[PDB]
Structure formats: structure tokens, C-alpha cells
Amino acid sequence: SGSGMAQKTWELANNMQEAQSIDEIYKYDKKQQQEILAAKPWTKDHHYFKYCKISALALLKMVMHARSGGNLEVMGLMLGKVDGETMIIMDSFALPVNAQAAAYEYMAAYIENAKQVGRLENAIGWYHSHPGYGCWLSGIDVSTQMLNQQFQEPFVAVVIDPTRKVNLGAFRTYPKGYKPPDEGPSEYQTIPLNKIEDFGVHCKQYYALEVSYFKSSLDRK
Numbered sequence: 001s002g003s004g005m006a007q008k009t010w011e012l013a014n015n016m017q018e019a020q021s022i023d024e025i026y027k028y029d030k031k032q033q034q035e036i037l038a039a040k041p042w043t044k045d046h047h048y049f050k051y052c053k054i055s056a057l058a059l060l061k062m063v064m065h066a067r068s069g070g071n072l073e074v075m076g077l078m079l080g081k082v083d084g085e086t087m088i089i090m091d092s093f094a095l096p097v098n099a100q101a102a103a104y105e106y107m108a109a110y111i112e113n114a115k116q117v118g119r120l121e122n123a124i125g126w127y128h129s130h131p132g133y134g135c136w137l138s139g140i141d142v143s144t145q146m147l148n149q150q151f152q153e154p155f156v157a158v159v160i161d162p163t164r165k166v167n168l169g170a171f172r173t174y175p176k177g178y179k180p181p182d183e184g185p186s187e188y189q190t191i192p193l194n195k196i197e198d199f200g201v202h203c204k205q206y207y208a209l210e211v212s213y214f215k216s217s218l219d220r221k
């Protein structure tokens with residue numbers, strides 16, 4: 001008696017509670033992110049971030065963009081958030097002259113599209129390709145990333161080599177005059193003879209993050 005109507009109400013409650021849960025999670029993440037962004041712990045610690053988690057969707061798009069330029073470098077922006085000492089990359093868009101108002105109004109639509117599905121994301125970094133020479137930061141890249149870790153902070157620098165298999169680097173520059181300890185050659189990389197000087201010179205002015213990869217519930221399509 002009322003068995004059929006009970007099933008419908010139970011389905012409806014299940015759906016209504018999912019939406020409410022999604023909204024609660026988004027709101028908790030938003031306030032938790034506004035907390036750290038106002039706190040700015042990365043301004044005091046120079047080895048703060050240690051991990052970089054990249055979504056399979058963001059990697060797909062970045063690698064696709066990287067490949068499309070062939071022998072020529074390519075660049076774009078990355079969407080994500082902070083989670084303690086980890087930089088999470090969830091999505092990315094290619095770049096791209098009056099002004100870069102397009103790069104600013106693209107960014108807003110991505111954040112907004114993600115908000116709908118209850119995803120909290122904002123500009124977390126920039127990516128670019130080194131077709132054939134490896135993952136590291138050129139002298140010009142180190143100047144770029146030092147400025148980014150001043151005006152765009154928190155901001156990560158991703159470098160993809162689409163020619164040579166998973167050849168990606170996630171990096172953070174150290175501040176001007178910061179002398180750190182330890183050794184950082186990590187994984188060996190064969191870079192050309194016409195780049196080794198620029199490499200070796202600047203290879204101490206930044207560090208590598210421990211890259212990890214993930215497939216989200218939404219990134220399964």
C-alpha cells in the first residue's frame with residue numbers, strides 16, 4: 001500500500017540529497033580555498049609545494065596542444081586549486097593584439113562551467129612545450145616563473161616534451177638570491193648540446209614537483 005509512490009519519493013530524496021551534498025562540498029571547498037589564499041603560506045616557505053596532481057583530461061588537452069605545434073613551442077593556461085603542499089591541475093586551455101582580455105574572459109567561463117557541476121577551480125598555472133629538448137626551465141622561463149610567483153601566486157610551471165614516454169615536468173622557481181641545500185638531478189635527461197649551458201646555469205634557480213596523475217568521476221567521458 002503506497003509501495004509505488006514510496007519508490008518514487010525514495011528516488012526523489014536520493015536525487016535531492018545528491019544536489020544538496022554537491023552544493024555543500026563546493027561551498028566547503030570554496031571557503032577552505034579562500035582560507036589558504038588569504039593565509040598565503042607559500043610566501044614564507046620556499047619549498048612549500050612538493051606535489052602536483054594532474055587530471056587525465058588536462059594532460060590529454062595539453063599533450064594535444066603540444067603535438068599540434070610540431071617543432072614549434074606552444075603555451076596555455078591551467079585551471080585547478082591548492083591542497084596543502086599539492087598543486088592540483090583539473091583543466092587547461094590553449095593560448096591565445098589589443099589586449100589579452102580573451103585569456104581573462106576564457107578563464108571566467110571555465111571556472112563558471114566547473115561551478116555548475118560543483119567543481120571548485122581557478123587559475124593555478126601555465127604550461128608550455130619544449131619539442132625535442134626535455135622538461136626544464138630556460139633562463140627566460142625562470143624570469144617568467146619568478147614574476148609569476150610574485151604577481152600570479154600560487155602559480156605552477158608545467159613543461160611538456162611532445163616528441164620523446166610521459167615527458168612532463170612541474171616546477172616552482174626559488175626567489176632571487178635564495179640559496180637552497182641538497183642535490184636535484186633526479187631523473188636523467190638527454191638535452192641538446194646547444195641548450196645544456198642555459199640548462200645547467202639556471203637548473204638551481206627552481207625545483208621539480210612530484211607529478212602524479214588522476215582520473216576524476218567527470219573526466220571518465
Ligand SMILES: CC(C)n1nc(C(F)F)cc1C(=O)Nc1ccc([C@H]2[C@@H](O)CCCc3cncn32)c(-c2ccccc2)c1
Nearest residue numbers: 073074075126128129130138140141143144145147148151
Ligand atoms: C605565464 C605566461 C602567460 N607569461 N607570463 C608572463 C609575465 F607574467 F611574466 C610572461 C609569460 C610568457 O609568455 N612567457 C614566455 C617566456 C618564454 C617563451 C619561449 C621563448 O623563450 C622562445 C623560445 C622557446 C621557449 C621555450 N620555453 C619558453 N620559450 C614563451 C613561449 C613558450 C611557448 C610558446 C610561445 C611563447 C613564453
Ligand SMILES: [Zn+2]
Nearest residue numbers: 136137138141
Ligand atoms: Zn621553456
